[PDB]
Design an enzyme around this catalytic site. Structure first.
Site, PDB file in Angstrom:
ATOM      1  N   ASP B  25       0.776  -1.232   0.000  1.00  0.00           N
ATOM      2  CA  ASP B  25       0.000   0.000   0.000  1.00  0.00           C
ATOM      3  C   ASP B  25       0.815   1.294   0.000  1.00  0.00           C
ATOM      4  O   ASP B  25       1.257   1.757   1.056  1.00  0.00           O
ATOM      5  CB  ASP B  25      -0.917  -0.076   1.225  1.00  0.00           C
ATOM      6  N   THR B  26       1.008   1.879  -1.179  1.00  0.00           N
ATOM      7  CA  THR B  26       1.782   3.117  -1.287  1.00  0.00           C
ATOM      8  C   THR B  26       1.122   4.304  -0.580  1.00  0.00           C
ATOM      9  O   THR B  26       1.758   5.341  -0.358  1.00  0.00           O
ATOM     10  CB  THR B  26       2.034   3.493  -2.768  1.00  0.00           C
ATOM     11  N   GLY B  27      -0.150   4.157  -0.219  1.00  0.00           N
ATOM     12  CA  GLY B  27      -0.841   5.227   0.477  1.00  0.00           C
ATOM     13  C   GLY B  27      -0.604   5.227   1.985  1.00  0.00           C
ATOM     14  O   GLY B  27      -0.852   6.228   2.659  1.00  0.00           O
TER      15      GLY B  27
HETATM   16  C1  LIG Z   1     -11.670  -2.905  -0.837  1.00  0.00           C
HETATM   17  O1  LIG Z   1     -11.579  -1.671  -0.120  1.00  0.00           O
HETATM   18  C2  LIG Z   1     -10.662  -0.746  -0.483  1.00  0.00           C
HETATM   19  O2  LIG Z   1      -9.851  -0.851  -1.412  1.00  0.00           O
HETATM   20  N1  LIG Z   1     -10.756   0.364   0.358  1.00  0.00           N
HETATM   21  C3  LIG Z   1      -9.877   1.556   0.241  1.00  0.00           C
HETATM   22  C4  LIG Z   1      -9.019   1.405   1.498  1.00  0.00           C
HETATM   23  O3  LIG Z   1      -9.239   1.981   2.575  1.00  0.00           O
HETATM   24  N2  LIG Z   1      -8.004   0.545   1.299  1.00  0.00           N
HETATM   25  N3  LIG Z   1      -7.068   0.184   2.277  1.00  0.00           N
HETATM   26  C5  LIG Z   1      -5.736   0.612   1.892  1.00  0.00           C
HETATM   27  C6  LIG Z   1      -5.475   2.090   1.958  1.00  0.00           C
HETATM   28  C7  LIG Z   1      -5.630   2.697   3.380  1.00  0.00           C
HETATM   29  C8  LIG Z   1      -5.343   4.220   3.518  1.00  0.00           C
HETATM   30  C9  LIG Z   1      -6.393   5.082   2.584  1.00  0.00           C
HETATM   31  C10 LIG Z   1      -6.221   6.669   2.738  1.00  0.00           C
HETATM   32  C11 LIG Z   1      -7.312   7.142   3.600  1.00  0.00           C
HETATM   33  C12 LIG Z   1      -7.423   8.548   3.923  1.00  0.00           C
HETATM   34  C13 LIG Z   1      -6.462   9.505   3.401  1.00  0.00           C
HETATM   35  C14 LIG Z   1      -5.385   9.051   2.550  1.00  0.00           C
HETATM   36  C15 LIG Z   1      -5.269   7.652   2.226  1.00  0.00           C
HETATM   37  C16 LIG Z   1      -5.434   4.551   5.028  1.00  0.00           C
HETATM   38  O4  LIG Z   1      -6.400   4.198   5.723  1.00  0.00           O
HETATM   39  N4  LIG Z   1      -4.383   5.257   5.450  1.00  0.00           N
HETATM   40  C17 LIG Z   1      -4.128   5.755   6.817  1.00  0.00           C
HETATM   41  C18 LIG Z   1      -2.853   5.288   7.500  1.00  0.00           C
HETATM   42  C19 LIG Z   1      -2.121   4.032   7.343  1.00  0.00           C
HETATM   43  C20 LIG Z   1      -0.911   3.840   8.123  1.00  0.00           C
HETATM   44  C21 LIG Z   1      -0.454   4.881   9.042  1.00  0.00           C
HETATM   45  C22 LIG Z   1      -1.202   6.124   9.181  1.00  0.00           C
HETATM   46  C23 LIG Z   1      -2.402   6.294   8.396  1.00  0.00           C
HETATM   47  C24 LIG Z   1      -3.322   7.482   8.373  1.00  0.00           C
HETATM   48  C25 LIG Z   1      -4.060   7.318   7.025  1.00  0.00           C
HETATM   49  O5  LIG Z   1      -3.257   8.014   6.067  1.00  0.00           O
HETATM   50  C26 LIG Z   1      -3.468   5.471   4.355  1.00  0.00           C
HETATM   51  C27 LIG Z   1      -3.823   4.516   3.267  1.00  0.00           C
HETATM   52  O6  LIG Z   1      -2.934   3.449   3.474  1.00  0.00           O
HETATM   53  C28 LIG Z   1      -7.076  -1.283   2.481  1.00  0.00           C
HETATM   54  C29 LIG Z   1      -8.311  -1.870   2.830  1.00  0.00           C
HETATM   55  C30 LIG Z   1      -8.942  -2.944   2.105  1.00  0.00           C
HETATM   56  C31 LIG Z   1     -10.217  -3.474   2.546  1.00  0.00           C
HETATM   57  C32 LIG Z   1     -10.912  -2.947   3.731  1.00  0.00           C
HETATM   58  C33 LIG Z   1     -12.255  -3.520   4.182  1.00  0.00           C
HETATM   59  C34 LIG Z   1     -12.804  -4.576   3.410  1.00  0.00           C
HETATM   60  C35 LIG Z   1     -14.024  -5.151   3.758  1.00  0.00           C
HETATM   61  N5  LIG Z   1     -14.778  -4.702   4.903  1.00  0.00           N
HETATM   62  C36 LIG Z   1     -14.242  -3.620   5.713  1.00  0.00           C
HETATM   63  C37 LIG Z   1     -12.980  -3.021   5.356  1.00  0.00           C
HETATM   64  C38 LIG Z   1     -10.243  -1.849   4.455  1.00  0.00           C
HETATM   65  C39 LIG Z   1      -8.960  -1.318   4.009  1.00  0.00           C
HETATM   66  C40 LIG Z   1     -10.706   2.885  -0.012  1.00  0.00           C
HETATM   67  C41 LIG Z   1      -9.740   4.087  -0.131  1.00  0.00           C
HETATM   68  C42 LIG Z   1     -11.472   2.792  -1.364  1.00  0.00           C
HETATM   69  C43 LIG Z   1     -11.761   3.179   1.082  1.00  0.00           C
END
Ligand SMILES: COC(=O)N[C@H](C(=O)NN(CCC[C@@]1(Cc2ccccc2)C(=O)N([C@H]2c3ccccc3C[C@H]2O)C[C@H]1O)Cc1ccc(-c2ccncc2)cc1)C(C)(C)C
Lengths: 99, 99
Positions: B25-27
């Site tokens: 996860d690059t984010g």
């Molecule tokens: C399939 O779902 C997705 O791809 N969801 C996306 C998402 O969050 N992806 N996650 C991956 C991405 C995380 C970031 C998204 C981000 C949010 C706000 C601002 C900037 C970036 C996230 O939450 N981040 C936080 C983070 C992480 C580590 C340390 C500090 C912080 C603070 C935030 O920046 C950064 C990204 O990594 C992984 C994931 C996959 C499935 C489920 C799920 C599955 C089934 N049921 C429940 C949960 C929950 C999470 C999104 C953006 C479209 C909502």
């Protein structure tokens, strides 16, 4: 270009004629944008993130430029602290992970 | 090697003598994993993702094997619905975004 990850991969995007900052996120299936105005009709979608689920407005076939690369696809508008560019659009611009 | 983004970039890492599946996860600033035990000191903090904040325990200097690389980094342990590898670790294996 090649983007290292020592800093957040923030890039400039263009949508609706306006420039915005967005994060390239390989961990996101979809693209989620902060409140803004888009044309046409929208459909509902519930997406899940690390903190829970949120409701968003889904707009389809929306033109959007990412780092100058043209794309046309689905964007979700809802509560987020930052514009996130997910895989649906990263694949359109030919983005890959390399090591 | 090159990893395309047509599908979720899942990999298998080795940590604390355990094997876990995680999303590149690059984010993510740092790696976040579901509840597990880790040695050493830790400090609590809140991370805000989509859907809200969750409380996690931050452990530093943790050995992790990923993509055939033995790296060391920070791990946030908490109630995350999905395990993700963040930039803190991706940089150590020379992972970059290209397009
Ligand atoms: C399939 O779902 C997705 O791809 N969801 C996306 C998402 O969050 N992806 N996650 C991956 C991405 C995380 C970031 C998204 C981000 C949010 C706000 C601002 C900037 C970036 C996230 O939450 N981040 C936080 C983070 C992480 C580590 C340390 C500090 C912080 C603070 C935030 O920046 C950064 C990204 O990594 C992984 C994931 C996959 C499935 C489920 C799920 C599955 C089934 N049921 C429940 C949960 C929950 C999470 C999104 C953006 C479209 C909502």
């Amino acid at each position: 270009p090649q983007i290292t990850l020592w800093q957040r991969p923030l890039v400039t995007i263009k949508i609706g004629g306006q420039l915005k900052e967005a994060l390239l996120d390989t961990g996101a299936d979809d693209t989620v944008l902060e409140e803004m105005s888009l044309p046409g009709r929208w459909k509902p979608k519930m997406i899940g993130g690390i903190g829970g689920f949120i409701k968003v407005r889904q707009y389809d076939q929306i033109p959007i430029e990412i780092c100058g690369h043209k794309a046309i696809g689905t964007v979700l508008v809802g509560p987020t602290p930052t514009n996130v560019i997910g895989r649906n659009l990263l694949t359109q611009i030919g983005c890959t992970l390399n090591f």
